[PDB]
Design a protein around this ligand. Structure first.
Ligand code: GAL
Ligand code: GAL
Lengths: 144, 286, 285
């Protein structure tokens, strides 16, 4: 049953910089790659009632969740409090993804670096968030 | 430690005509003022390996560049030696610019908003908006400055080239002539200055060392003559007073002959003793 | 100013660990004093960034490459790509460098000292992202204890006579402490001092008050430029150098007459670059 603005289920995750690049793991990093139609580009979003957040697992590796490391990278790890995400819906299915925890007593968010709107080969990072206007922190969750 | 206690101006690599400007706790980007409002002292903490950036405001004497966490805003607040008041000065070698990162959170660096004319914190990129030029305030004020030069023995007289063909240098009553105005240029390599007389294009103040203590204007296309270059040292307690020593021999200071003030009095070099006839006021032409 | 400079890069978190290259693999390894740990900094003015190129003798076109998007650093063939350019940010007052990727300036080199390799990290205040970039000659010679032979005969060495006799002459190598010198680089003066190991504060010194004579004297004579030297490599050689005095750089360390006999004087003389003014600075076997 729906408890929030973002229903449970499988999604593709995209940056607003590109409608043809898809979030998947590559080695221990997360990046946006060409459409593969595989499970590693499918993400299971689950709402957590107790903390009002979301945990997001990879369909190919259902026991691995989006998390972050001590080096600023978004990672794929086992369940921990680093796997809890607080989305801010800013458009139809465009979100800013904040870590639930304050990091360095700040809001931190998914951040993808761009070189003239090109994000090829860039790793997804966890960087400070100050508002809802940072294009590098805007991501699309598409139900599929 | 080589920047500790140094008083500097900070300008934008993105717009070199905009400088860090301070008033009443507000920090903004403003055109060059050549005064304390755009001057900052770098204060080093060895343990933190970071710097405080203290405003040289004459009224509020304990204001330092402060990050208003958790916002991305910047201001100047009373110095409490806090982490959000410390900064990493990271020199971009080969680019002659600095990235200035927050010591509290080095993920964030100073970012010049040249349209709002203020500063904010940002994540890093490859633009010039996070790059800044940190320069000794004397050099900053004097570099590319068009001035008149007066002895303190009489501020109504100026150091002048006689005329366009007569390259001699003497003391004369100020008459707003181009021969009485000089454009100062700092040489990065030589760490010294040249005084370009504005009546000529490539004419600089020069110690004619082959003729005793005589100084004259000569062409600057004589490349490797240290006698064409000068060190400009501020006199304490003063805003416009300097001693001017020659690069060839720093014991040779710009000298008003005999301390005489009459029109036509010779301008020369002489052994430095720091007397009033070796002190000069470098000033804005009115 | 760093363009085309050949340097070694070591870790602030562990100054005994250097950037090490072999067959495309970058690791952190102890000081080798050879090409395996030497890198040429190649400046691109438009990018305001540097390529970091291996001085490997076999593979001559390898540059430090970020294997984006992974956490891995390696050396790949130079294709002038963005993941092969680096911002060299000098942390002033700290005399160390942060090395940020041009491809993503948020990410900088991180020294994994326990795994003995490199990776990436967002900026922080840890020493693991700080690095010491140093001209390779200085890197090799600083704190290096050596023996100094003339190329005219590598069986003899420059020595202090004994603990009380402070004269300096040429003699056969007998592994004596009077025959070994610990080189120290003076940052301020940008020059070197040779500390004889039979004494604690004895340095090689030009006795200018006595013509061309050089002897060992105390290093607690603070402001004497005759106690400092410039060590310049001879082209095509791994161990040959010329040694010139800081007081007068035209004065080079000279083997008297070019004579090779035991007890031959060691002096300074006007530099001409002859074979009696070239020296091999070597590891004592
Ligand atoms: O060379 C003429 C000299 O005249 C002296 O009276 C004066 O003290 C010197 O500074 C110098 O001007
Ligand atoms: O000082 C005596 C001179 O003797 C010469 O034979 C030698 O080539 C010079 O370098 C110098 O040593």
């Amino acid at each position: 049953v729906e408890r929030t603005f973002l229903p449970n289920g499988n999604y593709n995750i995209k940056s607003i910089f590109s409608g043809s690049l898809y979030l998947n793991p590559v080695s221990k990093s997360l990046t946006f790659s060409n459409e593969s139609s595989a499970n590693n580009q499918k993400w299971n979003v689950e709402y957590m009632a107790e903390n009002r957040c979301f945990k997001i697992s990879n369909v190919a590796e259902p026991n691995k969740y989006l998390s972050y490391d001590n080096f600023g990278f978004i990672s794929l790890d086992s369940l921990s409090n680093r796997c809890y995400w607080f989305p801010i819906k800013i458009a139809v299915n465009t979100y800013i993804m904040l870590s639930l925890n304050k990091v360095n007593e700040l809001d931190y968010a998914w951040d993808i670096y761009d070189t003239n709107e090109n994000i090829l080969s860039q790793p997804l990072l966890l960087l400070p968030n100050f508002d809802i206007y940072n294009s590098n922190q805007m991501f699309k969750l598409e139900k599929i | 430690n080589s920047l500790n206690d140094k008083i500097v101006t900070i300008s934008c690599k993105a717009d070199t005509n905009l400088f860090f400007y301070q008033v009443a706790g507000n920090v903004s980007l403003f055109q060059q003022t050549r005064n304390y409002l755009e001057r900052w002292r770098l204060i080093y903490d060895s343990n933190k390996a970071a710097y405080k950036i203290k405003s040289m405001d004459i009224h509020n004497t304990n204001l330092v560049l402060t990050w208003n966490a958790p916002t991305h805003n910047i201001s100047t607040q009373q110095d409490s030696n806090a982490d959000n008041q410390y900064w990493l000065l990271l020199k971009d070698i080969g680019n002659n610019s600095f990235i200035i990162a927050s010591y509290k959170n080095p993920n964030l660096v100073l970012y010049a908003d040249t349209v709002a004319r203020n500063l904010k914190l940002s994540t890093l990129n490859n633009s010039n908006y996070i790059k800044f030029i940190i320069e000794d305030y004397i050099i900053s004020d004097l570099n590319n400055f068009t001035c008149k030069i007066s002895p303190i023995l009489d501020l109504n007289k100026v150091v002048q080239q006689v005329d366009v063909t007569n390259l001699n240098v003497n003391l004369y009553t100020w008459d707003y002539g181009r021969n009485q105005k000089w454009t100062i240029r700092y040489n990065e390599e030589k760490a010294a200055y040249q005084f370009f007389n504005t009546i000529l294009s490539n004419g600089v103040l020069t110690w004619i060392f082959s003729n005793g203590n005589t100084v004259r204007v000569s062409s600057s296309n004589d490349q490797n003559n240290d006698a064409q270059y000068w060190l400009i040292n501020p006199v304490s307690d003063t805003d416009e007073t300097y001693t001017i020593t020659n690069l060839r021999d720093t014991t040779k200071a710009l000298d008003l002959y005999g301390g005489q003030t009459a029109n036509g009095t010779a301008i020369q070099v002489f052994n430095y003793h720091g007397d009033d006839n070796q002190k000069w006021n470098i000033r804005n032409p009115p």
